[PDB]
Amino acid sequence: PHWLLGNLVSDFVDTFRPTARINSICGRCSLLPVVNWKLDPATLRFPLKGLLPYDKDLFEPQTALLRYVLEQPYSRDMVCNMLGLNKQHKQRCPVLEDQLVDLVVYAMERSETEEKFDDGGTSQLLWQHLSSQLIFFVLFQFASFPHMVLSLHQKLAGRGLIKGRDHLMWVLLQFISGSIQKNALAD
């Protein structure tokens, strides 16, 4: 706050912090088991109270919940009803693109650990479907292609995708072989 008003406004907000505390539930770990309101943030911030709540657990983007929702299959309608509505003319590439890029990066990192001993276990059996459902949800991903380029920008560091590049090419096929005639070759 402005230099003219010193400890006044700070102490006022301090003494009013318990009022906003009386409107908090908990650390908000994860509440989204079903796949058939609670935890429907608009853009990285769900709450409504205009007071001064506690630390950024209420201000920071709900990334853990979004990741835990996106990892489960058939969660597309759930993510839609959370924030999306007729994405054909309403979704101008929001931060869910960055969330999906982070999810794909984490998936590649998890597959980098021998991919369950060379696709022997079930980690690849979950990778395939977690990427297929993302491609299913991918209707405006290459829209604002910088979202696609961010994948390469993040994979440039670490360079641990020497083993998981095959699955990335697989999902790129799964998208392009159906979206080749629609989108131009330049994009």
Partner 1 sequence: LEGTMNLTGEMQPLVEQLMMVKRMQHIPTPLFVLEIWKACFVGLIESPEGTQELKWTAFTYLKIPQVLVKLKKYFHGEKDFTEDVNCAFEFLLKLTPLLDKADQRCNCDCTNFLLQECNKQGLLSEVNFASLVGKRTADRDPQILRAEPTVTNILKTMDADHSKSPEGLLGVLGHMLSGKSLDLLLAAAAATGKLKSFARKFINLNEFTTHGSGESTKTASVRALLFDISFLMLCHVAQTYGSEVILSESSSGEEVPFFETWMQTCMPEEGKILNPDHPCFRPDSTKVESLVALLNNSKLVQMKWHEACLSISAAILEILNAWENGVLAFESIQKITDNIKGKVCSLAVCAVAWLVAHVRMLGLDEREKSLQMIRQLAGPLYSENTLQFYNERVVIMNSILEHMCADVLQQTATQIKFPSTGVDTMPYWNLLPPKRPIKEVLTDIFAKVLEKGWVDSRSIHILDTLLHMGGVYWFCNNLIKELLKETRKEHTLRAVQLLYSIFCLDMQQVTLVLLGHILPGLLTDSSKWHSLMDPPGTALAKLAVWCALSSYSSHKGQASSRQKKRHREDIEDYNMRDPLNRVLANLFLLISSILGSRTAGPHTQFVQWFMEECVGCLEQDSRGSILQFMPFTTVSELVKVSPKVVLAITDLSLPLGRQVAAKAIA
Q: Which residues bind partner 1 (CB under 8 A)?
A: 1-3, 6-7, 10-11, 13-14, 17, 55
**In the complex, what is the shortest distance from the CB of residue 52 to partner 1, in angstroms, rounded to a whole number?**
8
**In the complex, what is the shortest distance from the CB of residue 109 to partner 1, in angstroms, rounded to a whole number?**
17
- The distance from CA 32 to its chain's CA centroid, rounded to whole angstroms, is 14
Q: Cα(72)–Cα(134) distance, rounded to whole angstroms?
A: 10
Which residue in 13, 26, 14, 90 sits closest to 58, CA to CA? 26
6 vs 146 by CB, closer to partner 1: 6
Say if CB 62 and CB 30 are below 8 A apart.
no
14 vs 77 by CB, closer to partner 1: 14
Q: Cα(186)–Cα(117) distance, rounded to whole angstroms?
A: 38
121 vs 160 by CB, closer to partner 1: 160
**In the complex, what is the shortest distance from the CB of residue 145 to partner 1, in angstroms, rounded to a whole number?**
31
**In the complex, what is the shortest distance from the CB of residue 55 to partner 1, in angstroms, rounded to a whole number?**
7
Q: Cα(139)–Cα(85) distance, rounded to whole angstroms?
A: 13
Q: Nearest 10 degrees: CA dihedral of 54, 58, 60, 64?
A: 130
19 vs 183 by CB, closer to partner 1: 19
Q: Cα(5)–Cα(53) distance, rounded to whole angstroms?
A: 21
6 vs 73 by CB, closer to partner 1: 6
